[model samples]
Each structure stands twice: as C-alpha cells, then as structure tokens.
Target: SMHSDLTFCEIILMEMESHDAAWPFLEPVNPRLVSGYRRIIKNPMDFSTMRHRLSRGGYTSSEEFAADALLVFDNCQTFNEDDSEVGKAGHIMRRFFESRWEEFYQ
Candidate 1:
C-alpha cells in the first residue's frame, strides 16, 4: 500500500475534530476575529483545511499529511500561550494525532 493513501488519515481528522478541545483548530484563524493574526502566523493550518486537501488528493505522502497535522499544532502554539484554551487544545490534538500516527507506522 502507498504511504500517500490517506483513507485512514481522514478518520484521524474526524476523531480529532470531535474532541472537546478541538474548537480552536476547527477552522482557519480569522483575522477579523483576532487582530494581527495574519502578521503573526503566516502559515496557518486547521482541520478543515487538512480535510479539504485530503479529499482533493492535494497531499502527496503520509509525511505531508502528518506535516499539516502538526502544522496546526505549531501554529496554535505560536499564536497562543501554553496555558490558554487554544494552546491546550493544540496539546491535546498533537497527542491524539501522534498516537494515531505511531499506530499507523507500526
């Protein structure tokens, strides 16, 4: 099986999104909702974007999908404090993604 096959990654996306802490990373960061967002975090990512890209076959490999998954976490931590709601959510999501990722690699 090809590593780029993301059929399983889609389930990961859905499971992560359903989590209680997934609010912040559910959608793209809205500049209007938060000021200076565009300047602070240029490479923004969210579950919605990842799922869209996955459905369209935009991701080329498991690495690419994992990169985007971690990208959301990185962007969250970059824009938010570690103790904040968003940052905590990132922590949760990062753990969830990594746990599933490891299982896949195993």
Candidate 2:
C-alpha cells in the first residue's frame, strides 16, 4: 500500500547537467532509471507504465520520470516502512534537491 514516491526523480534533477551527463550516473547505478529517462525523453507526458504498487505509483515527463527515479534507489521493505531506508533516502534527496532547486526547477 505505497503511494507514488518522488525520490529518484529528484536525484536526477541534481545530477543531470545535460543529456550527455545522464548515462554516466544512471547506467552504473540503475539501468531502469536510464530506461525510465529514455522512455520519458522519447515521449514524456505520455501514459507510460511508470506507476508501481507500493501502495501504488516518469521525466519532465523526463523531469517527472527523473523525480520518480528515486523509487529505484531502495528495496521493498525500505520503501514499505517509515523512517526506513527509503525514507532516509528521501530525506537525503530532499536536502540535496533543496540546495539545488533552481538548477532543476528552471
């Protein structure tokens, strides 16, 4: 019973410097994030299967997918509990994102 989490997507916002920068970070960390980025980059705001069933849940739609990318950061139990691994990841992500909000926001 998880709702949509927006951790990864936010991470991308901070990490992404350009289209070229995308691969170095994603490929090694998680191909799915790259896939998610590719999917949305090709056609964001489109209905992609970016949702999950934690309880529930893509880029600019790339941006959105980037935000959604956080979902891939942790495992099931982490995402399932409060102040859990996923939750901690979320806090870390938010702090990072807060520091670099303008970079992604604009």
Candidate 3:
C-alpha cells in the first residue's frame, strides 16, 4: 500500500510537472509535494506506522491516507516551521486541489 501511494504520488508529480505552466502559482510549489512524499516514504518504518494508523482509522488504501495527510499538513498553520519548504508546498497543493481537482482528475 505504501508502494501504491508512492506510485500515486509519482503520477501526481508527473501530472503537476506537465501542467505547471497552466498553474503559474503552483509551478515552483509542485516539487515540494513530491519531495515530501519521497521523504515520508523513504523509511519502511514510517510506512508501516502509516499503514497501522490508516487501518485503525478505517482507511482502505494509501491513496486516501496520503490525501488526508496532505490536507491535514496544509491546514495546520501552527504546525509549520518558519519558511518551511514542505509546509509552503502543502498550502499550494491544497489550493490546487481545491481549485482544480475535478479538472485534474478528468
């Protein structure tokens, strides 16, 4: 499931890169999402922990887990460090998702 989430994020990265020109505000912010996902998935223990948490929360897949994680990270402004790259990207990702999720999915 962690691999599935990684693959999903890889696809998101590709799509974001391809569509970067259309969303000027997101152009620079897109990479951090992938970098954060990469960082999160880099450790097997982290994935294992995520899987456990997701199971307890009744989440059926890593895709859902990733989405929730991104949204939560984006919303919690208090959780962000000063000038945090990943934190900034999370905000942009949430903006893009809010504005263009249907367009992206289609």
lDDT of 3 by residue, 8-78 (tens): 54454445435433232222223354456434433221223343454465455545655644544343343
| Per-residue accuracy of model 1 over 14-87 as CA lDDT, tens digit each | 88889888888888988998988998887888889988998888887777888888889998888889998888
Deviation of model 1 at 41, angstroms:
0.7
How would the candidate models be sorted by TM-score, starting from the highest? 1, 3, 2
Query: What's model 3's overall lDDT?
Result: 0.45
Off by over 4 Å in 1: none
Shift of residue 57 alpha carbon in model 2, Å: 21
Clashing residue pairs, backbone N/CA/C < 3 A, model 1 = none
Local accuracy of candidate 2 as per-residue lDDT tens digits, 46-101: 11234321113312244445444444333222323446544454455445444555
Cα miss at 67, model 1 (Å)?
0.5
Which clashing pairs does model 3 show? Answer: none
Candidate No. with top lDDT? 1
Winner on lDDT (1 vs 3): 1
Model 3 misplaced regions, further than 4 Å: 1-13, 16-66, 69-72, 75-78, 104-106
